[PDB]
Amino acid sequence: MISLIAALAVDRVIGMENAMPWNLPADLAWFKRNTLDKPVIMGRHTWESIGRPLPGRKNIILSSQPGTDDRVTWVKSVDEAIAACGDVPEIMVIGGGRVYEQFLPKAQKLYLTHIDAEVEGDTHFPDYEPDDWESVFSEFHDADAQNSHSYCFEILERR
């Protein structure tokens, strides 16, 4: 099945690491445990800002142009992207904005981190109709030593 994973600030705003003002190791830990050993699909900008392939995951990059790095798999369409995953139980889509928009209608689960930090940004996570999803898990954490902001993890599933 297809699953989306994103970190959202107030107002579902999303942005690249360096663009984001918060510092949450715990969220990274979470992102990591939910992605390990699964194929990860991301848009070219996200790939470029990540800067190296995610270890322990098959990395598939979406780009309308030919690939420029042999350490990852390059694809040219959403359909080709899903096909390159093979038969796996769950495919994780990691952004960006444009990739989220494209895969949402096809997703069955959403792993979201809600961050309490109002930031002025460019992109918003796509709007998901409250009617189609059911929250199946949540967990709040306040800020701390390591974590700069209070955050809440949540998993939703398509009803």
Ligand SMILES: Nc1nc(=O)c2c([nH]1)NC[C@H](CCc1ccc(C(=O)N[C@@H](CCC(=O)O)C(=O)O)cc1)C2
């Ligand atoms: N939950 C969540 N948090 C985020 O910050 C992001 C999302 N999702 N999804 C989209 C996007 C992807 C950006 C992104 C993804 C991974 C790493 C990363 O380094 N992952 C390492 C974590 C290293 C560590 O343990 O901190 C990894 O191996 O997964 C950095 C930025 C940023």
